[PDB]
Structure formats: C-alpha cells, structure tokens
C-alpha cells in the first residue's frame, strides 16, 4: 500500500532470509548490507525511484544464496518483482566459470530494470573490492574480477549514465576500458 | 530526495553502524535485523507513513549502542529525526536497573512520534521473547521484562490502537494488564 512500507517489506524479507549469511571481508560483515548498499545507490547515485526495481535490488541474491521460492518471492511482492529477481539470479548448480560466462553472455539480452540491478551490484562489489580484499584473495583474484566485471558491464551499457561513468572511472583505474 | 531514497539512506547507515553488533538470540542474528523489524511494525501494523519516524525508529538504537553522534544524525537526517533518536536514547552510563526506572519516568512525558518508536520497539522484543530465550536467560528473567515492559507501555498508552491492543494481548497472556 505505502512506499515506506514496501521497501521496509523487502528489507526485512532480505534481513531474514540473510540473517546467517556474511560477506568475505575479514570482519565477516553481515550480507544485509549489500543488498542495503545496493539498493542505495539506485536511489542516490542512478536516481531510481521505481519502487519495484529497489525492491529486487533489495532481495536480488535471495533466491540465488537462500531458502527462498520464486513463488515465495511473488507471493509478498508481485510477478514483476518476481521476475527482476529471476534475472538477477545466478544458477548456484553451475561451476563458477560457467557462471561467469552466463553473466557475460545474459547481460544484453536483460531488461532494463535487471540491468539497473546488476550495474549497481557491480559498482558497491568493485568499492568493496578496492576498500578491501576478501579472505584468501590474492591480489591477481581482484584484478581478474574486475576483469570479468568490465565484461559484464559492457553488455549493460546504455541503461544508467550515472552508474556507467562511475563504473567506467574504476575500470579505468586498472587499466580497463568500458 | 526521495521517500525510497530516504528510507534507505536511514537503513544503510544503520546497518553500518550496527555491522558488529549481534542480538542476544542463540544463532546471533545481525542487530541490523531488529531495528528493521521495528520501522517495518510502525507501517505495516501501526499504519505510520511519516518518513522521519520511520528513519528514527530504523536509526532508534545508533547513539545508543554505536559509534554514532547527535550531529552526525543531524547531518544526514535533520533535527527532527535526531530529537527523535534523542528521546530513544538510554543512558549506557546508568546501571541496568536506573535505565529502567528512566524509561518508565520518561514514557508519558516523550513526544507522539517517540512513542511511536518506543511502542514497536517493546512489540519487537516481547515477541521476540516469545519466539526465543536470550542466551543465558532465566525464564524468570523473561518474565521480568515483560513486568518492565508493561510499565513502561502504561506510559506510551493513547498513541496507537493497534500496536497498544497488540501489547495488550501479549501482556495478558502472561497475567499482565494494560
Ligand atoms: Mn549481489
Ligand atoms: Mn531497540
């Protein structure tokens, strides 16, 4: 019904299925924040205000990373935030190569509002990547992960000026062009 | 800027300022949880729209348990959202037992809006107490708060229907009353 409280939904929902799930930084920082961070930067950096988009941004690694339904996800927030999360969801069931390639391989072919979540998903990683090394990667691991991120992002282009030029800056910063 | 854009901003810093703090539960679920739990009682159960509540109950325990400052809350949320989280701020300074009697002394006399953030608050953690016993908790102890919780909710009654029916309910089924 309220704006306020469809985001405070999502976020919750997130907080939940999340709440055993930390990022690899040495501090093993709750995952919340990075679908937190995410969605913040659609909002203050893309200018986004669709409410559906912040909201996938929100859960868009629930499905992927835990016990979460794609029927569940439509139930509390509509098939068209069901289907966003279905776009952002990585296949688990696939090597991590392959994987990657998916990502490269799916990015063009995404729709708008999946490509606005993957820019912004890029972009707070790379931050992160650059603020601090995750446990057990080597300096070589960072550089081949912006690396395959350039490859992605390159398929996203032409959907946020905002997020692209920032995106483009750090890749520039390791010798990589858009 | 936004609505979206202002709730998210308050969540984010939040959940920053809270990254090490744990609840007191078994598994130690992210704190970050509970303050999101709390905005998300005051507009799905309360039916609150206003924004600055909202951003004062996701922001209620910064100050408090945090290395957060009145005017760093000013900054990024304005006065009204900082004299909020003023009126929700206990004094870690007094003992256990002196910040309970604060809390029962201050109740009646804190504005519409810090009543708001302190009747959720109170909704959370009574669930949340039926729902699991902190670690180290005596089923006394438990019971305990809830005595504290009641005479502190006397104190906040003629603010909300829903949220104070829901309070009553709880209360009762553990012989308490209003
Ligand atoms: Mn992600
Ligand atoms: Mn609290």
Redesign the pocket.
């Given at each position: 019904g309220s704006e306020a409280a469809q985001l405070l939904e999502a976020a919750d929902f997130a907080a939940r299925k999340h709440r055993q799930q930390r990022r690899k930084d040495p501090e093993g920082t709750p995952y919340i924040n990075?679908?937190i961070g995410?969605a913040r930067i659609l909002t203050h950096e893309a200018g986004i205000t669709d409410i559906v988009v912040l909201q996938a941004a929100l859960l868009?690694?629930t499905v992927?990373d835990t016990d979460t339904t794609l029927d569940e996800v439509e139930l509390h927030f509509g098939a068209q935030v069901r289907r966003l999360v279905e776009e952002?969801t990585d296949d688990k069931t696939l090597p991590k190569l392959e994987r990657k390639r998916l990502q490269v391989e799916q990015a063009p072919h995404s729709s708008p509002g999946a490509k606005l979540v993957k820019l912004a998903?890029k972009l707070?990683?790379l931050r992160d990547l650059n603020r601090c090394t995750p446990e057990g990667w080597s300096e070589h691991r960072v550089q081949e992960y912006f690396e395959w991120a350039a490859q992605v992002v390159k398929g996203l282009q032409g959907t946020n000026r905002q997020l692209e030029e920032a995106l483009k800056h750090l890749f520039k910063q390791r010798g990589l062009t858009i």
């Open positions: 990075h679908p995410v868009h690694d992927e952002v998903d707070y990683n």
